[PDB]
Design a protein around this ligand. Structure first.
Ligand code: ZN
Lengths: 69, 89, 135, 114
RNA sequence: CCUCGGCCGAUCGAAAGGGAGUCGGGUUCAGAUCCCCGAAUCCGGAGUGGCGGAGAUGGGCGCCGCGAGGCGUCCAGUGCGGUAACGCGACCGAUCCCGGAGAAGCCGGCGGGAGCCUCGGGGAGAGUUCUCUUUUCUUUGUGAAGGGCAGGGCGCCCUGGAAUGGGUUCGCCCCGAGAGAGGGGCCCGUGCCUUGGAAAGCGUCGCGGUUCCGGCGGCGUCCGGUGAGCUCUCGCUGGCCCUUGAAAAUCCGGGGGAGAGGGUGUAAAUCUCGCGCCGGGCCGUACCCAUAUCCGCAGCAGGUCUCCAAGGUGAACAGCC
RNA sequence: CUGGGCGGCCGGCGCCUAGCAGCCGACUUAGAACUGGUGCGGACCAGGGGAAUCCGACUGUUUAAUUAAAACAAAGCAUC
C-alpha cells in the first residue's frame, strides 16, 4: 500500500486505465480515498470535510465507487 | 596472589612440578604482546603456532612456535647477510 | 618555499575525481571565512582523450580527441602536487570561486576549461597531463 | 502464557530455521521466519579489517534486484576498494613512476658521460 | 570461414549444510502460510519499442522582433552535488582481469531491542460479601511489503595539535601512524508512528430473521512505571588452541576500453528509475510421533531425534503447591 | 531526573560553589527493641568425620547380558 499526500497525484492515479475502484471511508477524524490498482492500493487521507465532498464530485466517471458504510 | 606458580596456577596439582615449571616459561612468551618492528606499537600477538599478527598495522609475520623470534632465526639472518656481503664485496 | 602556485599539476586524492589530473587555477594558502583551511580552485580532466593511431581516420581521431572537464575547490590534503606544470591561459573571469553558486556559470567554467584543454592536447605539448594515471 | 509451534516441517534449530515473535491483528503471537543477516563488501586491499561504506548489507541473491547506486560509491574502485587504499595506490603509482623516470635519466646521463 | 576458449573433466551424494520470493482475517466432520477475502512479493518473458521519466536538449556569431521571443550558421553535450567520508531516480559498453558476498570454531563479560513476568491507575464482565475488602479473577490487537523517526554500532571524514599526559571500560583498551573538543558520513534498523487499519479480530450490552446470515446495532479496545529478572535476538569486546574451526552452485562490485549513437533533431544508441501486460509446470501435504498408530511376537514399567515453556517458595529448568 | 538572577529577553543590576530545593524509585545489607511451652535452613531441598596401610599419578576408558578394578589408555621418559 502506498500513501499519496497530494490531491493532484490522486486524480492522476484514479484516471489510470489500471484503476479498478475507489473506496471512500469516513472515520472520526479523516476521510480516506482508496484507489485499487494492479500493484498498489493508493490511499489519500483528507482531514477537511469541505475538501472531501469536493473530491467526490471530481472523481473520474465510469470508475466504480463504493462507500464503506 | 601466588608465591611461585604464576601463570600455571590454572593447572593446580594436575601435572608434575617440573612439567608445570617448563610450560610456565613457554606460556608467558606465547601469550605476551611484543612491540611491532614495523609500526612501533606493542600489539604483536600470536594467531597460531609460528604466526604472529599486529592488530594496528595488520602485518602477519612467520615467527617461532612460542616466541616471536627464535635464536636460530637471528643467527641465520645475520649469517646470510655476511654471506651476501662477501659475494658483493 | 611555497610551491602550490597557479599552473601546477596536481593529482586528486579523494572524491569522484580521485586519480584524475588537474591544474591549480587559484590558490588560497590561508583560510577564507567560508572554509578555514587551505584550498585551491582546480580545473581537471574527467574523461581523458582516447589513444589515436595512424590507422584511424580523421573523423575517428576527432571523435576520440574529446575531453570532459571539471572545476572544483579542494583541500590541500586531498591534492598530490606534481613536478609537472601546465601553462594554459584559463580565463580567470570565467573560472572563479563564484562559479559554484550558479549552475549556469559552472557550465561556462566547464566549457572554457574544456575548450582550452582540447587546443593544448591537439598541439602535442604537455603529454603527461593528458595521459590517464594507471592505478 | 501462550506457547508457540513451528510453522514449517523443519523441527530443528538450524541456521535456516531462525524465527522471531510477532503479534497479529488477531491478538495472537506467531513465529515469523527471518532472513539471514547480510554483510557489506570487504575491501579488495586485504589489509582493512572493516567493511565498505555506502553499500547495503544484504544477502547476495537479493543484490541483483537493487539499483546500481545502492551497490557502489561514486569513485574509482567504488564498491570494491576503500577510500584510504585507493588514495595510497594513486600516490604509490605516481611516486614509483616518478622514480623510474629519475632512474632512467640518471642511467642515461651516466652512460653519456662515461 | 577468421577471432576468442584450462572445465584445474561425465555423473551421483543433505526433506537438519548452502539456496530469490507471503502474510493477516475467515472457512471443515475431518484441509490449509495450500481453499475464500485482502494486502504484497520473487523469478522469467515481452522482439514487432506498452506508457512516462533519464540520456537531453546549452553556448558563440549575427538578423528580425519596441523589447520578449523566433530565422540562419558554428561548436558542445555516454548526468549531477559534497573539501571529504559519501550522496541523488536512472546515469552506455564486450572478450579479458581483480575482488566481494555465499563462507565459518568454542567459551566468557557487558550493552540495545523484543516477548514473558511484575507494579500503579482507568474501562467491560464475573466471583465473594456471616464480617471485612473501594476488593479478587479474566480481558484491555495491528501481518508482510513501503515511508518517516527514535535507538544501536562504526580501525569512516573535516578542522585542530595534546606532558602538569589525557580519554575511557564491569574488564580492558586508545592516541603526533592524530587523543580530548567540535561538526559531519555510513550501516543496521525485528522498535515507534504511518499506508495497510478497522471495514477486520476480540470484550461486553441489545435487536432480528431462521440452523445459518463473517446477520444488524451501541460502547470499548485506555494512561503510565519498573528490572544484574527469564528467553530469543542484534551488537561490542576479550580468553583458548602443537585443535585455527567446509565446498560448490548462485549473485554482485570494480579495473580496462575493443565498440555503438547523432549531427543540433526535438534527436540517437542506451537506462540496474517509476508505472503497465503475460506466466510459474512435476512430486509431498490427512493423522500418531508414544506408559495405545514406531521397534521390542502385544495397547510390553524397555528403547526412539527436536521446538515453545506461566504464578509462589527458593541459588536454580532442584524438590513442593 | 529537573532546576537554578500569556510567553519571551536588549540589558550592568544576579552568583548554584561545606551541594541546596523539588519530584521519582527498586532491590538488599547491617544494627536494635519486643515476642512465643528455646521453637525457627520447622515441609521440601540438603557433605558424617579423623588417624593410617596397599595399588594406580591425576581427568578419561573397559568385558551391551554376573568381573568398573590395582586392568587399558594417557602426558613424560627411552629405544629402533
Ligand atoms: Zn605493527
Amino acid at each position: 500500500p502506498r500513501k499519496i499526500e497530494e490531491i493532484k497525484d490522486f486524480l492522476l492515479t484514479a484516471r489510470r486505465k489500471d484503476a479498478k475502484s475507489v473506496k471512500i471511508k469516513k472515520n472520526k477524524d479523516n476521510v480516506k480515498f482508496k484507489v485499487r490498482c494492479s500493484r498498489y492500493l493508493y490511499t489519500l487521507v483528507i482531514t477537511d470535510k469541505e475538501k472531501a465532498e469536493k473530491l467526490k464530485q471530481s472523481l473520474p466517471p465510469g470508475l466504480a465507487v463504493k462507500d464503506l458504510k | 596472589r601466588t608465591k611461585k606458580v604464576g601463570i600455571v596456577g590454572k593447572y593446580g596439582t594436575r601435572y608434575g612440578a617440573s612439567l608445570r615449571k617448563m610450560v610456565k616459561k613457554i606460556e608467558i612468551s606465547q601469550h605476551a604482546k611484543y612491540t611491532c618492528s614495523f609500526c612501533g606499537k606493542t600489539k604483536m600477538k600470536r594467531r597460531a603456532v609460528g604466526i604472529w599478527h599486529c592488530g594496528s598495522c595488520m602485518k602477519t609475520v612467520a615467527g617461532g612456535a612460542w616466541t616471536y623470534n627464535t635464536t636460530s632465526a637471528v643467527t641465520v639472518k645475520s649469517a646470510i647477510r655476511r654471506l651476501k656481503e662477501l659475494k658483493d664485496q | 618555499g611555497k610551491f602550490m602556485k597557479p599552473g601546477k599539476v596536481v593529482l586528486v586524492l579523494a572524491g569522484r575525481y580521485s586519480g584524475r589530473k588537474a591544474v591549480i587555477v587559484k590558490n588560497i594558502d590561508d583560510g577564507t571565512s567560508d572554509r578555514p583551511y587551505s584550498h585551491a580552485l582546480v580545473a581537471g580532466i574527467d574523461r581523458y582523450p582516447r589513444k589515436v593511431t595512424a590507422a584511424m581516420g580523421k573523423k575517428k581521431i576527432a571523435k576520440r580527441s574529446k575531453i570532459k572537464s571539471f572545476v572544483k575547490v579542494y583541500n590541500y590534503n586531498h591534492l598530490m602536487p606534481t613536478r609537472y606544470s601546465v601553462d594554459i591561459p584559463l580565463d580567470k573571469t570565467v573560472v572563479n570561486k563564484d562559479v559554484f553558486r550558479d549552475p549556469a556559470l559552472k557550465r561556462k567554467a566547464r566549457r572554457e576549461a574544456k575548450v582550452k584543454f582540447e587546443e593544448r592536447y591537439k598541439t602535442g605539448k604537455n603529454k603527461w597531463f593528458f595521459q590517464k594515471l594507471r592505478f | 502464557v501462550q506457547r508457540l509451534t513451528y510453522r514449517r516441517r523443519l523441527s530443528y534449530n538450524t541456521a535456516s530455521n531462525k524465527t522471531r515473535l510477532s503479534r497479529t491483528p488477531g491478538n495472537r503471537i506467531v513465529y515469523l521466519y527471518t532472513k539471514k543477516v547480510g554483510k557489506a563488501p570487504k575491501s579488495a586491499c586485504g589489509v582493512c579489517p572493516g567493511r565498505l561504506r555506502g553499500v547495503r548489507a544484504v544477502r547476495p541473491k537479493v543484490l541483483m534486484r537493487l539499483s546500481k547506486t545502492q551497490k557502489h560509491v561514486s569513485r574509482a574502485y567504488g564498491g570494491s576498494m576503500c577510500a584510504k587504499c585507493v588514495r595510497d595506490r594513486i600516490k604509490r603509482a605516481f611516486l614509483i613512476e616518478e622514480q623510474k623516470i629519475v632512474v632512467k635519466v640518471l642511467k642515461a646521463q651516466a652512460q653519456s658521460q662515461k
